[PDB]
Design a protein around this ligand. Structure first.
Ligand SMILES: *[C@@H](C[C@@H](O)c1ccccc1O)C(=O)O
Ligand SMILES: *[C@@H](C[C@@H](O)c1ccccc1O)C(=O)O
Ligand SMILES: *[C@@H](C[C@@H](O)c1ccccc1O)C(=O)O
Ligand SMILES: *[C@@H](C[C@@H](O)c1ccccc1O)C(=O)O
Lengths: 324, 324, 322, 322
């Protein structure tokens, strides 16, 4: 096991949820992870051709799982993968010592890296955030680190000079990236990081810089991964042939499928219900069973739930359309 | 031990820090609590006449202590207090199950309640926040609960209908309250909660409603508690006599002493450095030894540090001025 | 002689700019109902108001034409007959326009201008201070009421701003919002009468009964008997030390306002500040505010309902306190 | 005949409103240096610009007097001689004023108005849509360029807004900021030429080289050779498929802008948008932007230094690419 670099990060990187038992919204329940569905999902993603698996971000419920639940979940993922694809766990926590303690334990179980935001009880500034990731990578230098650059969840907004500093840390190999307004500059400031746009932004981002932009992250794949596999294969054919017509059609399809996900189109309103909306979309699509949300985040306004289920139905149809 | 109500919450309620050892900014250190200073502070606050002790909020480093550190700190506080004043621990965490687990353990050690914000990885909405506090009070019904109504730390903004819902929960007995623009209405919506304004707002708040506003919280007391004791005694003399002149002079003194605390007067900018600024103020005042900040929050811009030290010097002088 | 803070007492009511029934049409040219203007002023004074402010946000200072403004003030100036003080409003997009407007309307017979700041570009503190010093120096016979609304004017009117405005003789008063820093601001600005919102006057008067002697009211456009009763009752409370009846009136006023703000949110209310106030007033039936001049004539129906319910509650209160 | 999106190509440069040396004084009355206006236009066209926008934020649409605006456009209209298209700017505080301004300046010989929305009260989506439909219907010979700046105009110009503007023939183009949703917006608004910022044109052209054929530039006021070279080089790149030299030019432009934003913060830059741009231009020495009309003549010195460093970098680039 030799540590991951940015060169090893290509293709469809799919973020899976942490499947929950039918009583997982109850604070009294203690072993709420469905390890059978957890295993089954891993088998079907790898069989579908995904290049790598991320986990334990916001909708993966890193916030609301217990430590014993996280260890059993990671263990099951690791066994089932059997080293066939790289795997990132997630270990964001409220302080640097807890982050380090979790990362050490989950790397030892067999995850290859951690998808990592920053502690967010106190809003972090730029030097605080740089030193945080430096401390972690120095404390566990065998862990690859994916920056989870979510300003809604983590308050800190991951600005341009932050990315210049992360490119200096060998462990930081990739980033779960949101809007691409400054992707052109961030690629220049951060040559050593594989920036993963969102799946819907992969088309545009790869056109900006087809040399650097070779991978993306997907949560839509939890509704049926054929669409993400099709987009990956068609973009890389497009880079060679110069014919982006079919790649644009898939990408436009993916955008339309997400058109009801965010309440009122509002990322901040979506962020209040990130966990529930992603899981309900996934529940609705029927490709896997995400299940109820662990507390406190088990209350979603019905109007918002409907938007997520419509998106989930739209992605299941896209999976059928782009299958075989 | 019969559970606290709002009627038992009067006077100067002082928030103490979690004293740290000289190497506490280092993530490698593991037992960073100075239990001797922890004990010494408790003895001197009780000797000074404080009516109650809060702890483990933002600057008390609930975010960055380890669990073994929190148990040793609470244990030491509890022993030293010897039931002479009520004590609130702090158990905010990222989910409801961890909050419950911590609260149970620290109540068993001997704290009388918990100062409790809300999980903040996902921004909470109003029903989510109400049900969170309901779940906790139902799971540990012997715990008194002080709402830590900090919208900067916890994203959720604790609006008026939230307070109407908390007044319905017997366990919720008090609140660490910030601006008083809507205190008049919140008192009406929440008859069963003792609202603690900030010490600098106690003068105005007690004039608004001297029947309901009988207590306040203080962090300035960690620079010398005579000023808070003097303000408490003089406001209650003012309520009876109707002569608020001396109470206004103390309160104006306290406001001027805080005039350099917030960088540029900005609560949000102060909130990025809440821990470091409070501790540096306390370090500067010399009444107790707060010490270095546990990681990641150990980096404060020097200009900001100077403002905090000036405030700390201003409060030490106020303590001398209002002593004996 | 120009107003000082010592002249600013009791209930100060903010007047809409009443509009003719074609006022939403951008083709319209003279959309002020000058007869309803005159009649509101007569009825306001008869009811015992202490002074009249106007031409702020819901007064449509932003959407009136210049000639419409000239005719409005003239109508108000001559209906008042010098019986109460009157502030017009002249907030515009730059200092020179603010000055040119303040000159003409003071000359027509306004006592002062209720004034926010140009807000195309958000000002910092020195920009705002200099702006107010510029206007005060340019029209020194005009009093100034700071219209301190950060939602409309972006700038948040912080503590050091109030200290500076106390340095300007012309700044006699301030239409003030949340009272969380009022105790401090009264200390920093000794020469300014701070007007809390009518619902906040009870608490503010109790904080500092010497300084807090006046408030501003828009609910009085629904029937001014409630605001007049709150002024008289608070004045009696400051002498008897018995605030029960003042708290009863104040708690009624909050209740009547409880459906005004869409979702309880001040910033969502600010998006429809014009429409919701005038729709509330129209539903109260004390006066006819009329359609909103373009572009702010579109308001969601759920929000409109909330303001009409509030108009009905204030109009009920006016009957309760007549 | 009125412009369509098919007429909007290449480098579109935004002109300051040059000011006489007394222009900061609120007592001043005619503060446009009409001879510098005329001379900038001559030099811009000679340099090969495709079209001229003006009178946005740093163009001081907010702080010019009406007569100053009339004389400015006349000077531009007659110096252009119909050689390139010209957009004036007529954003004001209400629809009727926006219309009255657009009529006169189009009549003087502007081809369109660069237009944001009234911003005393923040508009929602239907308010903004109706506002633009109102203006387009009221001056149909005028083209419209949406000036989509949420910092100045509060409203954030979301995706459903762009779909509506594509329904309006007059809306031919958009001065556009961050490009994170450009791919989607191009799909929702087929009839609008989207102008990215000059630094963003490289990436946007690569996303959609058929649609992204034009950009807006304020750095060209520091010396327009860099923007002209980026247009020609990007056009060659779309044919050769070789983007190395376009990326070199683009990366130079970002570097020259790297000290413009105080603390890298767009919202802090927006507080001094007028002053920082004109101070940058003054320091470049290609033209004389001049003092800022009140009230926006105060800028912190550290920020001023940052803009002057940027002016020097762009002026260096102009020499590099002449
Ligand atoms: C990461 C994914 C979320 O941050 C996100 C961001 C944007 C759109 C949709 C989603 O789910 C995670 O929750 O682990
Ligand atoms: C609570 C106190 C902070 O929330 C706070 C709020 C306002 C002014 C100063 C301080 O420290 C805590 O950190 O436990
Ligand atoms: C001032 C009054 C508004 O700013 C306001 C503020 C709070 C509640 C209600 C209203 O109308 C004005 O419109 O001139
Ligand atoms: C438009 C240009 C400004 O909105 C802007 C935006 C971003 C960077 C620089 C500038 O000037 C205008 O001022 O009319």
């Amino acid at each position: 096991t030799t540590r991951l670099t940015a060169e090893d990060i290509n293709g469809a990187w799919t973020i899976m949820p942490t499947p929950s038992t039918p009583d997982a919204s109850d604070w009294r329940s203690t072993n709420t992870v469905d390890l059978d569905e957890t295993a089954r999902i891993v088998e079907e993603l790898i069989a579908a051709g995904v290049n790598g698996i991320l986990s334990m971000g916001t909708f993966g419920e890193c916030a609301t799982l217990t430590w014993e639940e996280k260890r059993d979940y990671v263990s099951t993922v690791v066994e089932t993968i059997r080293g066939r694809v790289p795997y990132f766990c997630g270990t964001t926590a409220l302080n640097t010592r807890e982050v380090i303690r979790q990362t050490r334990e989950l790397i030892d179980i067999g995850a290859n890296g951690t998808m990592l935001g920053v502690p967010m009880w106190v809003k972090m500034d730029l030097p605080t955030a740089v030193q945080f990731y430096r401390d972690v990578a120095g404390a566990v230098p065998e862990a690859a680190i994916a920056i989870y650059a979510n300003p809604e969840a983590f308050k800190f907004d991951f600005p341009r000079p932050f990315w210049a500093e992360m490119s200096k840390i060998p462990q930081v190999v990739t980033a779960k990236y949101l809007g691409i307004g400054m992707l052109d500059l961030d690629l220049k400031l951060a040559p050593n990081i594989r920036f993963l746009p969102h799946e819907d932004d992969y088309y545009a981002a790869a056109r900006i810089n087809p040399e650097r932009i070779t991978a993306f992250w997907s949560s839509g794949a939890m509704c049926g991964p054929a669409t993400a596999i099709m987009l990956r294969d068609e973009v890389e054919r497009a880079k060679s042939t110069g014919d982006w017509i079919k790649a644009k059609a898939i990408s436009d399809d993916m955008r339309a499928a997400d058109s009801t996900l965010f309440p009122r189109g509002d990322f901040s309103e979506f962020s209040k219900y990130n966990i529930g909306l992603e899981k309900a979309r996934m529940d609705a699509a029927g490709w896997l069973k995400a299940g109820p949300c662990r507390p406190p985040y088990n209350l979603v306004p019905e109007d918002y739930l409907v938007g997520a289920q419509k998106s989930g139905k739209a992605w299941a149809a896209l999976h059928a359309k782009y299958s075989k």
